[PDB]
Structures are given as structure tokens and as C-alpha cells.
Amino acid sequence: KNKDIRIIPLGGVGEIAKNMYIVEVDDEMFMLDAGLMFPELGVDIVIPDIQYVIENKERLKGIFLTHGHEHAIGAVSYVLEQIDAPVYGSKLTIALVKEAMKARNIKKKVRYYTVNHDSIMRFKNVNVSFFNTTHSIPDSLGVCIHTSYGSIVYTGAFKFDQSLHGHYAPDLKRMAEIGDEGVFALISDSTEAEKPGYNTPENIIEHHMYDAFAKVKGRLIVSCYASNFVRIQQVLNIASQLNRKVSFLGRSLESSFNIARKMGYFDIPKDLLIPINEVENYPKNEVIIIATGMQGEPVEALSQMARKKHKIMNIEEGDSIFLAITASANMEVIIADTLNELVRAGAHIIPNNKKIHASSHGCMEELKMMLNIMKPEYFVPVQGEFKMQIAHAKLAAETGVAPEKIFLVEKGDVISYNGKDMILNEKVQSGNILI
């Protein structure tokens, strides 16, 4: 029988990125996600301060990674330099973590444990199960910690989109079973909680991308995260239909892509991909360049190309730009500055369609669907700035979660439960580590 529960965000509240959520059930502690954030010169990345975990490291039973986005796994190698705990994730997530460990030349012996939606990981106080979620990277998993009070469910990043199948398909039946069995606390993604309706389905997104790219008279540069496999696949498809080759600019894309291709995640025509060095050999209208940072920070790379400071390839008069990111308080200024730089350089920015809502994260109706499936007793909105958390809390109340059981937390807050009351009466060390 479980007695005491603690839920502590170390990153990913008050921001979109660097997600890391500590859950303790009595004397066992679990880290849910371990993301990085790209700085809002003199810092490459920002990771959570894990001093609290270090002070209690003997109780850390595992790091559970939902999906291979940098905002979910970016810190893992740095965490592992301080603590030896097992790393649980999908087969794709695990492969991406290994690649990051290699990239940093880290020799330390890591205990990876591949999990899937059938995995049940048994600990002394709890069992942990998983369910497939839909996101822009395949084989994403939500995490379900079973306690004697009911399940503690962490969604990670997710949306609901019936046009995505295969390794993107959600486990709706398993999710309904979890909700039916009794969810004590839902910890859910707030990124797009301020946006009404549903995300535009990806089949519609791909058709609008086609229309936009077919108008492009010169070169096309697409800026996105290395982990946005959906967008990458769309570009590959459209390139094939438009008789354009595709080239990658940035290592984390070449690496993430090679890994994923070897594992069977991509549908690639022969003769489509070319090395960045061979791009100048084509007419401009026969090339799409997908650009992400060397670190997988796309806008940084765009910014350099716009200012003609990039090492490998720069923007020219008449290039067209497709920016495939939504923005956060942290990235707003660099996006704005980068857009100005592009227009100054004579590039054409492909406009967002007004009818198109493109995100990897559930809008209001998708978050309500998760709330209505899970039927949680307590709700902790995370993965968002405070305004997004508030918007998500409002949705929870609409679905019928008792407003006194919805907790709005900041980094380092401790939500605790003793079997009678849920409280927020303690803080632990938290903050940003600049790398």
C-alpha cells in the first residue's frame, strides 16, 4: 500500500522546453523526461538543475523518456554524468539517446531499457506501464505509474490526429482502460492549450505544403526540428512529386535521419537525397534544403544563413523559406529578427494559411479528449508557460475536474499527497544550468 506521493516539476513549466518531472511514491523516485532548452551568445543549451535529485539520488529508480524530441531527451547525457539510473524509452528514443552520448564522446556505462506499450516495469512500490501517443516523432509513449491511490499518468507531448497511422497511432483502447481503472493524477501537455478547436490534420497540412511549394520559383529552405519526422516525410513526398532533390543541412538531422532510416521509419524514393556539397550542381528550382542547427536548433541555423554567416550554405536573393516551428516566449525575438534578416536578404517567406493550425501538440479539443478519457481526480497541467497552464486548467474544469484538485505549479514546487489532502507547501531547488 502506498502512502506518500510527491510531484515536482524541475523544467517545462513557465516554458515550453526542458521538460523534467519528478514523481516520488514513498521511497522511490522517478524522473519523467529530461529535456533541454535552446537559449532565449555564451550559452549553447540550458538544462534543468537536478540538485534535488542528486541530494536524493539513492532513491532514483529510473529516467522515463516519452519521445526523442530535444525538449524531452536533450539533458539526458548531462543527467547521466551525475547519476547512474536506468533509462527507459521506446526503441527509437533509446537509439537517439545513444547517438547523443556518442556525439559527446561519453564513455560511461549506461543501462538502457527499451520499452513498448506492452512493457510493465515492476519496482518495489509501484509498477509502470506505457501507452502509444501521437506526436510528430513516431513511437512516442505516455507513462502510467500505478499506485494504490490510482494511476499517475504523464502524457508527454501528444496530439490527436486520425490521419496519422502506423507508429504514430494512439492507443485509445489502452487509454480508456487506464481511465476506467482510476486515474489519481493526470500530468498533461499544455503547449497549445490556448488554441481553440483541433490541430489541422497532417494530410491537410501536406496538401497545403504541396500547394505552397509548387509556387516556389527558386530554391526552397525548410526550417524544422530534426525530430519532426512528420514534416520531414511530407517534404520528401512533395519533393518527389515536384521533381526536386532534398539535402540535409545540420548533423543532428543527418544523424537522426540515418538512425531512423536504418530502423525503417522513412518512406524514401531512390535518387531523392543528395549531399549538401552536390546542391550547387542543380538548378535552384530542383532543390529543397532542410536546415536544422548543428545542435538541432533550426532557427539559429536560419539566422546564420540569413546573415550569410553559415559555414556551409547561405541564403541568396530569391530563395523561399518554409519555417516549420511554432514559437514560444523563449524563441519569439530570434524568429522575429531572423524573419527581418531573411526579407532584407531578398528571401520570400512562405505565409501561414489562416485556416491552418500546424502543431505537434493538442489544441483545446484534443486536450479535452485526453481529460475525458483519463477522467483524473487531480490534474497538473505542465509543458507550458503559465498562461498555457491556466488555459489547460480551464479545460480540465470544463471536463469536470474539481477546480480545487487542479494544481498550477512553478519550477521547484512540490505537490504532495498523504492519502487525505493534496497540497502545495514546499519548494525544492530548481533553475537553469547553462552549458
5-197+359-434 and 202-349: identical CATH topology? no
Give the position of cell 522511490. 28
Looking only at the bridges linking them, the beta strands covering 220-224 and 413-417 are unpaired
In CATH, 202-349 is 1.10.10.410: no
Neighbouring-strand partners of residue 379: 186, 406
Distances, alpha carbon 240 to alpha carbons 100, 286, 290, 387, in Å: 31, 10, 14, 41
All cell numbers assigned to 62: 529510473
Experimental technique behind these coordinates: X-ray
Q: How far apart are CA 347 and CA 235, in angstroms?
A: 19
Give the position of cell 491537410. 204
Q: How far apart are CA 119 and CA 141, in angstroms?
A: 11
Q: How far apart are CA 215 and CA 353, in angstroms?
A: 14
Resolution in A: 1.8
Q: How far apart are CA 220 and CA 208, in angstroms?
A: 15
* Alpha helices for 192-294 (secondary structure H): 202-214, 229-241, 251-262
Phi and psi torsions of 92, nearest 5°: -70, -45
Q: Answer whether 160's CB lies under 8 Å from 170's CB.
A: yes
Q: Show Cβ contacts of residue 325 under 8 Å, excluding neighbours closer than 6 positions.
A: 223, 224, 225, 298, 299, 331, 335
**Does residue 165 sit in helix, strand or coil?**
coil
- Calculate helix-pair angle for 202-214, 229-241, nearest 10 degrees: 40
- CATH entry, 5-197+359-434, from 3.90.850.10, 3.60.15.10, 3.40.50.720, 3.20.20.70: 3.60.15.10
Q: How far apart are CA 73 and CA 328, in angstroms?
A: 19
Name the region of 89 (left: φ>0; alpha: ψ -120 to 50; beta: rest): beta
Q: How far apart are CA 268 and CA 387, in angstroms?
A: 40
Residue 161 CA from chain centroid, whole number: 16
Q: Answer whether 19's CB lies under 8 Å from 383's CB.
A: yes
Q: How far apart are CA 185 and CA 203, in angstroms?
A: 33
Q: Answer whether 266's CB lies under 8 Å from 260's CB.
A: yes
Q: Answer whether 259's CB lies under 8 Å from 190's CB.
A: no
Name the region of 358 (left: φ>0; alpha: ψ -120 to 50; beta: rest): beta
* Alpha helices for 6-137 (secondary structure H): 51-55, 70-73, 76-82, 91-103
Q: How many CA atoms lie within 13 A of 206 on its CB side?
A: 17
Q: Where are the domains of the chain?
A: 5-197+359-434, 202-349
Q: How far apart are CA 54 and CA 187, in angstroms?
A: 23
Burial of 277 by CB count in 10 Å (0-12 exposed, 13-18 middle, 19+ buried)?
Answer: exposed
Looking only at the bridges linking them, the beta strands covering 127-133 and 120-122 are antiparallel
